Design a protein around this ligand. Structure first.
Ligand SMILES: CC(=O)c1c(C)[nH]c(-c2csc(N=C(N)N)n2)c1CCC(C)C
Length: 113
């Protein structure tokens, strides 16, 4: 229950804040399946911040939980695919932590709308 335009503005700002936490830009674009031929063997739904931006602009996120679910996929896919002793795995842990804080604040803003 709220106006659509301010909610989308909030999600755009939140998505920018989450991307800023991915300093290596390793989550900015889809995992290149040509370079990782086995990626889809066990990853059911790839996700990345560019796809999230597309989904946002296509009006596919109309509540906070659907936005947060796709962010959580970025994290969970990376934890699943990569071994614990890799930079990629630790980057996903760091994004989970830093992004979680961004998301809690953004949700508190939405609840005032
Ligand atoms: C495995 C994984 O989880 C990846 C995540 C989160 N991002 C990327 C990525 C984005 S862009 C790019 N570019 C090149 N040239 N590999 N790799 C990967 C695949 C990395 C390869 C080297 C195993």
């Amino acid at each position: 229950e709220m106006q659509l335009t301010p909610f989308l503005i909030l999600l755009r700002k939140t998505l920018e804040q989450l991307q800023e936490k991915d300093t290596g830009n390793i989550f900015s674009e889809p995992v290149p399946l040509s370079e990782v031929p086995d990626y889809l063997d066990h990853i059911k739904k790839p996700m990345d911040f560019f796809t999230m931006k597309q989904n946002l602009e296509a009006y596919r996120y109309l509540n906070f939980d659907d936005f947060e679910e796709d962010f959580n996929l970025i994290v969970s896919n990376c934890l699943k695919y990569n071994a614990k002793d890799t930079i990629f795995y630790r980057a996903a842990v760091r994004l989970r932590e830093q992004g979680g804080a961004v998301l809690r604040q953004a949700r508190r803003q939405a609840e005032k709308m």
